Amino acid sequence: TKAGSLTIVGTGIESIGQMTLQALSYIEAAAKVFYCVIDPATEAFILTKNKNCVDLYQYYDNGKSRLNTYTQMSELMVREVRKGLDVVGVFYGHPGVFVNPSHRALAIAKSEGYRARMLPGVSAEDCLFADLCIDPSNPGCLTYEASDFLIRDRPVSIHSHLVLFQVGCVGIADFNFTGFDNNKFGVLVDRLEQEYGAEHPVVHYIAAMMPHQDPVTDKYTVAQLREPEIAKRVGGVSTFYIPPKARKASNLDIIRRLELLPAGQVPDKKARIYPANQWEPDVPEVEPYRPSDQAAIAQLADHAPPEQYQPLATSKAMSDVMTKLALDPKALADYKADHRAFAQSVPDLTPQERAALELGDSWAIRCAMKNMPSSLLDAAREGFPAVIVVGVI
Amino acid sequence: TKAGSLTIVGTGIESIGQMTLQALSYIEAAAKVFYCVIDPATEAFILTKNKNCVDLYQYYDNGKSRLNTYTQMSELMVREVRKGLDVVGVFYGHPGVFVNPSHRALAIAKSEGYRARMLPGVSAEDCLFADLCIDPSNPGCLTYEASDFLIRDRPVSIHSHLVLFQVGCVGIADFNFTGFDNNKFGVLVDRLEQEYGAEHPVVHYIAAMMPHQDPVTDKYTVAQLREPEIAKRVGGVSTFYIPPKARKASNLDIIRRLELLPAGQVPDKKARIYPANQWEPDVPEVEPYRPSDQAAIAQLADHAPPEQYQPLATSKAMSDVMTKLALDPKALADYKADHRAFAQSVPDLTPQERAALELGDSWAIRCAMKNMPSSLLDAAREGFPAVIVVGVI
Ligand SMILES: C[S@@+](CC[C@H](N)C(=O)[O-])C[C@H]1O[C@@H](n2cnc3c(N)ncnc32)[C@H](O)[C@@H]1O
Numbered sequence A, B: 001t002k003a004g005s006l007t008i009v010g011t012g013i014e015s016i017g018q019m020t021l022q023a024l025s026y027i028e029a030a031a032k033v034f035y036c037v038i039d040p041a042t043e044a045f046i047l048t049k050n051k052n053c054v055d056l057y058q059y060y061d062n063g064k065s066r067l068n069t070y071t072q073m074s075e076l077m078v079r080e081v082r083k084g085l086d087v088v089g090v091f092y093g094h095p096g097v098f099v100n101p102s103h104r105a106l107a108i109a110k111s112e113g114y115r116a117r118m119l120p121g122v123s124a125e126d127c128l129f130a131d132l133c134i135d136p137s138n139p140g141c142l143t144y145e146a147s148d149f150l151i152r153d154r155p156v157s158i159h160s161h162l163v164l165f166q167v168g169c170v171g172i173a174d175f176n177f178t179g180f181d182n183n184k185f186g187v188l189v190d191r192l193e194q195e196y197g198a199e200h201p202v203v204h205y206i207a208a209m210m211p212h213q214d215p216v217t218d219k220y221t222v223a224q225l226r227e228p229e230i231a232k233r234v235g236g237v238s239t240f241y242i243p244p245k246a247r248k249a250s251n252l253d254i255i256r257r258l259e260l261l262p263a264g265q266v267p268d269k270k271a272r273i274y275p276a277n278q279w280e281p282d283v284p285e286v287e288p289y290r291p292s293d294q295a296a297i298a299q300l301a302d303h304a305p306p307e308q309y310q311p312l313a314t315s316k317a318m319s320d321v322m323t324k325l326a327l328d329p330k331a332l333a334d335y336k337a338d339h340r341a342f343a344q345s346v347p348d349l350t351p352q353e354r355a356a357l358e359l360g361d362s363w364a365i366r367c368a369m370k371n372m373p374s375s376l377l378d379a380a381r382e383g384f385p386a387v388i389v390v391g392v393i
């Protein structure tokens, strides 16, 4: 009911392309846009999409506390919210991943009774998984801010992924336009030596910021980070990935309780699913085409869709309206305000489609857009989407 | 040089809107698309963008090992790569976050000498940060697959965020179209009780999959998860967030070595930056407008952009070409093949813009698109973007 909203969105890391469709649509719909991005092509792109933009980066200054900058950035956004405007804040990457002023501004807006939401974006860590070819699930992921990691002595796990952000400004609370003098970097390297050993790998990671660039994926030993020529390459957009040192064994009690109980030769702790993590030291070669793989592939020739598979069975009118709700914030607001009024004015919907939109229930819409076989609903329960694309062990 | 490529992309979690612009452009450019998504509107959207799509979900079956399904999914993609086609695989969320077949297919493609890349997307964890209003940086984040968490007895940190994926299929290696009988869920709850206590909060999180839905953000005690009516709400798209139990103190030796050495009352371990994590038990109220905040806000009236701030100073022709490189994979390929030939045929570029594109160097492009003040380059070094938007302590 109250006038004014704050939506904070991301641009992703790589220029323009890593912005989500909804981030773009909210930027276009906004009364006022406040942005903090790294690359100028993304900045130029944003300015073509809204006429009323303000660069938040101008609120940094040499020797000025970053906290003071963050309070100001937040306040610039919330001031416009209080005037009754639909405000969009834009931060590079994911706007809530290692970002102070977004969370501050949203919390203030929410506490004062305004609509407040963060839309997720693609983070530097998302880029890291993609470029280093690792999955956080295998074998778990610990993610820290590098100064916090040291100051609070945060735990490492030698059996899991370790990701460290802000390794180029260790112990630095202020700002400089010409970059950080990272002279406490040696304190980080000492901690990494204690935890992993001097010959354990550390990957210096920088995601490509422009579409034609390759990422920096440079493997060094912990010891090599002490070399001045290597240490100087670490800057404000550098992230470290430290791979596990070993594989963790299975817990017998849990094997029993989960009834994985052909316990004899439940694949040995080093019997990896292809592909193995290529950054992990002394990682053995894993066969991609084992006899079991070859047999699975042989079944493709005779494959038919299972009885209980639900083929898409929708219409242009329904796909058009579902697309509009996702890509037009104004249409979404209209729909949310009055499902029935909105649904009844959508042209060319079938009766079922109209009814599904009137209700708004997830299952009714899914039911309108997919043919649910009788085989399924004889077994199925009166949400259950069920799309699980990773299997551990 | 070799014909055939594999690009694996994501759709994000929320229908359509959380797809990145580059994911969309690669889907449109592909010779063949293979997809595995949850919601039918996203499926319908994909089918409007390419004429040659295959749903990978049909390769699941009741009682069929998920590993066999993953081998088949991978093989369907790589077969088309081997024929010399530009293939795009599409997985919901981030396609390398808790996904087996993407990493398998990319690794095989790369080993056989084909172009292979994963484009990052918005994961369920990205959504979690946005919807639960937390930052992984404060106070660090541990992320695990729930079965792996139990089977390998993965460590928790009571001072950091804990995120658990696949809490609805604990110990289950196969599949069923009507969903999982999660009868080993109690084993997870036992572990959470041991680590956190019976009265510690656990947030049941489900990101909205359709644009009009609200997320599920239901806080329960560990003990409440044993209640059958609560346990049954946990399904195949459920993720758990467990907040920290306490704040970790600072390490005196590191305070010394980082020279944060007005050590007396360096803000006490509970002197939080606003806003506090609202899920953390017994979290004190944090003042958003302290005297220091009010003073920072008072400086806004007299603010001018700093000397060393670099205003955007580009052209429509340059912003157009940088946008085209990000949004048109064919143009990007042409540019990467011959920078000079491509640059010289771009209409209306200035000499500097043309020269910057010919080189392709990050700094030359930035220099062409931003006015670098003399004040900056008198101090600055001959990349240093420097955009750091979070400050710990
Ligand atoms: C203030 S934080 C903001 C992170 C951003 N919100 C995100 O979603 O990744 C800055 C830190 O992000 C990481 N980062 C930013 N750009 C990066 C890039 N191109 N490659 C790798 N890491 C990057 C670095 O660790 C950097 O010090």
Ligand SMILES: C[S@@+](CC[C@H](N)C(=O)[O-])C[C@H]1O[C@@H](n2cnc3c(N)ncnc32)[C@H](O)[C@@H]1O
Residues within 6 Å of the ligand: A387, A388, A389, A390, B013, B091, B092, B093, B094, B095, B096, B097, B098, B099, B122, B123, B124, B125, B164, B165, B166, B167, B168, B205, B206, B207, B208, B209, B236, B237, B238, B239, B240
């Ligand atoms: C096979 S994984 C795939 C994850 C996906 N690639 C991603 O980027 O998040 C499935 C797990 O993701 C999480 N997940 C999927 N959809 C979700 C949603 N709408 N909300 C919360 N978690 C979700 C759940 O933990 C689920 O068991």
